[PDB]
Design a protein that fits this description.
The structure is cut from a larger assembly and holds chains A and B. Chain A is built from 15 helices and seven strands. By secondary structure, chain A is mainly alpha-helical. In chain A, the strands form three sheets. Chain A has a three-stranded parallel sheet. In chain A, strands 1-7 form a two-stranded parallel ribbon. In chain A, strands 4-5 form a two-stranded antiparallel ribbon. In chain A, helix 14 packs across helix 15. Chain A is globular. By secondary structure, chain B is mostly helical. Chain B is built from six helices and three strands, in the order ααααβααββ. Chain B has a three-stranded antiparallel sheet, with no helix packed on it. Chain B is elongated, with a radius of gyration of 25 Å. The chains are: A mainly alpha, B mainly alpha. Chain A: One of its GO terms (molecular function) is ATP hydrolysis activity. Chain A: Keywords: Acetylation, ATP-binding, Cell cycle, Chromosome, DNA replication, DNA-binding, Helicase, Hydrolase, Isopeptide bond, Nucleotide-binding, Nucleus, Phosphoprotein, Ubl conjugation. Chain A: It is found in: Nucleus; Chromosome. Chain A: Belongs to the MCM family. Chain A: This is DNA replication licensing factor MCM4.
Amino acid sequence: FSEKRVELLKELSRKPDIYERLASALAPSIYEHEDIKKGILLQLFGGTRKDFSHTGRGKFRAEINILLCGDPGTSKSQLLQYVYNLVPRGQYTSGKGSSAVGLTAYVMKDPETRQLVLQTGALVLSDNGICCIDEFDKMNESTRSVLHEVMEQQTLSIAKAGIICQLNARTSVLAAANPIESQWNPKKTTIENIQLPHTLLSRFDLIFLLLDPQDEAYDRRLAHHLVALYYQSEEQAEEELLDMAVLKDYIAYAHSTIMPRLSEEASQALIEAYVDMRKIGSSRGMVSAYPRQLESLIRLAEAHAKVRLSNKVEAIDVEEAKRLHREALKQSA
Amino acid sequence: TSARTLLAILRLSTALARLRMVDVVEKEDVNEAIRLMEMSKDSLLGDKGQTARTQRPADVIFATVRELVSGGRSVRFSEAEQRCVSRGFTPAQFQAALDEYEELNVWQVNASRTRITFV
């Protein structure tokens, strides 16, 4: 790192439009649908990990887990291969092509060293980064069971075949589900559409769904955009959009310099906002009574203040955390 | 029809522009591209989607009078002809078309046929 690039990142932090310019850079084709990829930008930051070993709770993850759903090919074809070539800490793997125990750290015979040594996988090497994995709607049954402690307990405890080993690998994992008919059914609620159990969908933070309305005016703002950039070569990409060399250097500085934390005024809004989101009803009923969404709400406030380059969290970033969670409710209802 | 078929239309635009040894596209490469699409979707069924319309010599005449009913009631007979002769409607067929609807009780005229008012 040099001083010829850190000063340019500090001048953009004071601008109130840095959060909107960086969110639109991840959409090189689709004009709308910005709320889907809006939460992905905050996934790379996550938040500063804290320690509480003096109270009996040492391990604690501050990473954000985003949940997606839609047609694997319509609008999710570019959101699964673009976060792999730019981010160096990305590991791509297949769900159905790989085994359940083969993805993590399993046990395999080795007569060369005369000892049952362990083997690596894919998500166990991308620590403090981002993992890439597709096909979550038709994944293996045995693979869904081992995910109850990886992204939840942050401790892969595998004690079988006389092998006592507890891995401490943790990595934010994203998913892209799909309905039973790849289309939203207004005749049924959103609970029956998702085939995943209640214990699986509750571990995710936000939730979105790729909707294709049949409105006539909807195509006037989407079909007129892809054709405009279809015949144009490379005479406008580096003119109206910033390069990718700044995004890779913007996240490699705040992850080891700015450690934000909660205060006494901005933390009082998390209690009042938690009670209002409990008595929802109508759709499912009196749900959301777990410390899961309360813990995920704190991670959203730490990620918004990390992009602003400020350790002090005010009441402005708290109002922006609940706004992203409010849009996720109207999307799945 | 979703976003998967949107990019397929632009793909067929270059299949015909490269056959004439040119680097531009014309209207011929667009009409012929959608011609194979309409023929393929009709072959997936058991019939062909067509239409039926009879060129009535008094169908567009009643639609022209509708432009004056929504604006006023006492429409002048000489003023209503200021828009019929613009496109190219013959005035001889208008005299024989008034009795086709006045007989079926639609509007009414006077003795001199100079006052028309929508009832």
